[PDB]
C-alpha cells in the first residue's frame, strides 16, 4: 500500500496502457494492409480458405 518498494497501481495502469497500445497496433496493421485477415496469425481458417480461393 504505502510502500516505497512496490507500486501495484502503476503496474495495473501499465497493463491497461500495454493493452491499448496493442489494440492501436492492430488497428495500424488493419489500416496499412486494408484486410481483416492479412496473415495466418490473424485467423488461420479464413486465411487458408481465402488463399485457396485466390
Amino acid at each position: 500500500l504505502n510502500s516505497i518498494n512496490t507500486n501495484p497501481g502503476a503496474l495495473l495502469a501499465l497493463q491497461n496502457l500495454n493493452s491499448t497500445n496493442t489494440e492501436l497496433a492492430a488497428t495500424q496493421g488493419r489500416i496499412n494492409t486494408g484486410k481483416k485477415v492479412a496473415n495466418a496469425k490473424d485467423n488461420g481458417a479464413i486465411w487458408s480458405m481465402a488463399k485457396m480461393q485466390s
Binding site: 492501436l24 497496433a25 495500424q28 496493421g29 489500416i31 496499412n32 486494408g34
Partner: peptide, 10 residues
Amino acid sequence: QLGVQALSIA
C-alpha cells in the same frame, strides 16, 4: 496514402 499515415502513427 493510408500506409504513409499508418507508418507515421507507428
